[PDB]
Structure 1
Amino acid sequence: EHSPEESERRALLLKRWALFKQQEHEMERDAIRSMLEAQQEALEELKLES
């Protein structure tokens, strides 16, 4: 059975683990929007051309 200190350590790494995943998702989440918007912007450019 885990000791409170052992549970204390495991809980702590979850906190930083949560932060690490959050930052990656936010950067990756927004990167997708720019790419989709970028493609739409290019579509507008071709529409202006022809």
Structure 2
Amino acid sequence: EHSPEESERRALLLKRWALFKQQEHEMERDAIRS
């Protein structure tokens, strides 16, 4: 079971992981268009 500090630390990077995926999809969608 994750500690409350772990969730806060994970919560910050999960935003980055979402951001990393979101940027990839924009490039991926544009890559498909090209």
* Residue ranges of structure 2 left out of the alignment (5+ in a row): none
Residue 2 (structure 1) shift? 2.1
Once the two structures are superposed, residues 17-40 of structure 1 have per-residue CA deviations (whole angstroms, 9 ceiling, x without a partner) of 00001111101101211xxxxxxx
- With normalisation by structure 1, the TM-score equals 0.56
The structure with the larger Rg is: 1
> Identity over aligned residues, as a percent?
100
Q: Distance in 2 between matches of 1:7 and 1:25?
A: 26
Please tell me the root mean square deviation across aligned C-alpha atoms, in Å. Answer: 4.3
- With normalisation by structure 2, the TM-score equals 0.72
Q: Distance in 1 between matches of 2:32 and 2:6?
A: 39
